[PDB]
């Protein structure tokens, strides 16, 4: 099966459960562990469910 997946831009792990996305940039995603690191500082990240 070949499918589109959401991959964490902080650690390359799967983004499952809560998905953090940049409020400004398209195609930016963090898992909940990496969001706690504060990555992509300067842009607010938004909490969403994951696909
Ligand atoms: Zn991560
Ligand atoms: Zn951004």
Author numbering: -3 to 47
Direct quotes from the study:
However, an understanding of the manner by which the ZZ-domain binds to type-2 substrates is problematic since there is no deep hydrophobic pocket in the ZZ-domain, which is known to be involved in the recognition mode for type-2 N-degrons. Therefore, we determined the structure of the ZZ-domain in complex with a variety of N-degrons comprising three type-1 N-degrons and five type-2 N-degrons. As described for the R-BiP complex, two aspartic acid residues, Asp129 and Asp149, bind to the α-amino group, and Asp147 forms a hydrogen bond with the first peptide bond, which means that these interactions are conserved in all different N-terminal residues. However, the side chain of the N-terminal residue of the N-degron is recognized differently. Furthermore, the hydrophobic side chain of Ile127 guides the orientation of the side chain of the primary residue. Therefore, relatively small and branched hydrophobic residues at the primary position might provide very weak (or no) interactions with the binding patch of the ZZ-domain.
